[PDB]
């Protein structure tokens, strides 16, 4: 799911050719605003991961009786930096970053049971008070019979860190996307960069046009169904009674 940054910039030359970002007026060649370009591309990737799933992750929490709040932050995760004031209870899973948890989706115990999320008055309900924290009531401990939990959630990739010495290559950086959403990302970036420039009648609408094309492309990807989509088929026949 990777692409060389080199190809991205070479192609974005073909749509940013009007403006400062990439071209000297004479002998059009890429400038050194590459930091700003990368900062825009990362935002584009995050937006695409918002619009389509494209990824999902997994954790494994080791419970502790009498605990009320379990935050999911990269200081509690094994292999991260062990801040002394916190016990590292997240013992397994994808490495956690600043933007990794877009939404928690499933909670599965060690017994194979499936608990309920934000479904009030359900038997064993788990509540998220702050979108990245699990609030576990005492009734859960009363009737839990589970020593660990498994969490699944919608992911977004962690962008690679650029550096002033890394300005040498900038071509070994790898964006994390399939190629389809690359074609869409081009329009996103072009719109964002071209918006605040131009004072002529037809040159004042390029940002708007690129936004329109971006939306159209997103709709086309949805229609072609080039993203993950689970579809549920329960049993309903093994409860005992529907047969």
């Amino acid at each position: 799911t990777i692409q060389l940054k080199q190809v991205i910039d070479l192609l974005a030359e073909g749509e940013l050719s009007n403006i400062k970002y990439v071209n000297i007026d004479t002998g059009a060649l890429v400038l050194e605003r590459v930091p700003s370009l990368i900062r825009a591309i990362n935002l584009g990737v995050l937006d695409l991961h918002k619009r389509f799933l494209l990824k999902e992750g997994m954790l494994k929490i080791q419970l502790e009786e009498g605990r009320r709040l379990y935050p999911l932050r990269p200081a509690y995760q094994v292999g991260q930096k062990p801040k002394p004031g916190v016990p590292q209870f997240i013992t397994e899973g994808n490495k956690l970053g600043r933007q990794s948890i877009l939404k928690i989706e499933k909670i599965i115990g060690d017994n194979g049971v499936e608990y309920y999320l934000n479904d009030t008055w359900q038997p064993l309900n788990i509540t998220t008070p702050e979108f990245d924290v699990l609030e576990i009531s005492d009734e859960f401990y009363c009737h839990s019979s589970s020593k660990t939990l498994e969490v699944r959630y919608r992911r977004a990739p962690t962008p690679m860190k650029i550096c002033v010495d890394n300005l040498d290559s900038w071509g070994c950086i790898d964006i994390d996307l399939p190629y389809t959403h690359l074609q869409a990302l081009l329009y996103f970036v072009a719109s964002r960069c071209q918006t605040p420039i131009g004072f002529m009648e037809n040159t004042a609408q390029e940002g708007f046009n690129f936004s329109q094309k971006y939306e159209a492309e997103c709709a086309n990807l949805d229609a072609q169904n080039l993203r993950i989509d689970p579809v549920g088929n329960q049993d309903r026949f093994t409860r005992g009674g529907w047969v």
Binding site: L53, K103, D119, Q122, D222, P230, Q234
Partner: protein, 96 residues
């Protein structure tokens, strides 16, 4: 001829009812997000995006409708056979 025609009509009706899509349920794309889709599959209450009422967004296929002509044709063929032979056999219905 009567036996052949009755067999053909019955096979046609069987094919119509069998090759259908009874039992499957289809959902409009973009009417439910991921979490609401999971809730709907699980079997609890849920929420749907505006502009897509469930009565049109979801659909549960069933058996198609047999037209009113196959029944008539079978009745006609059976009556003709009974008239030809001359024995009513107390049939084409309850033996009584």
């Amino acid at each position: 001829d009567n036996q052949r025609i009755i067999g053909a009509v019955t096979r046609g009706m069987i094919d119509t009812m069998a090759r259908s899509a009874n039992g499957q349920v289809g959902v409009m794309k973009g009417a439910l997000d991921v979490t609401n889709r999971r809730r709907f599959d699980r079997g609890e209450n849920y929420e749907f995006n505006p502009g897509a009422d469930p009565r049109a967004a979801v659909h549960m296929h069933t058996f198609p409708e047999i037209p009113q002509s196959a029944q008539y044709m079978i009745n006609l063929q059976q009556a003709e056979a009974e008239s030809m032979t001359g024995v009513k056999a107390f049939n084409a219905g309850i033996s009584g």
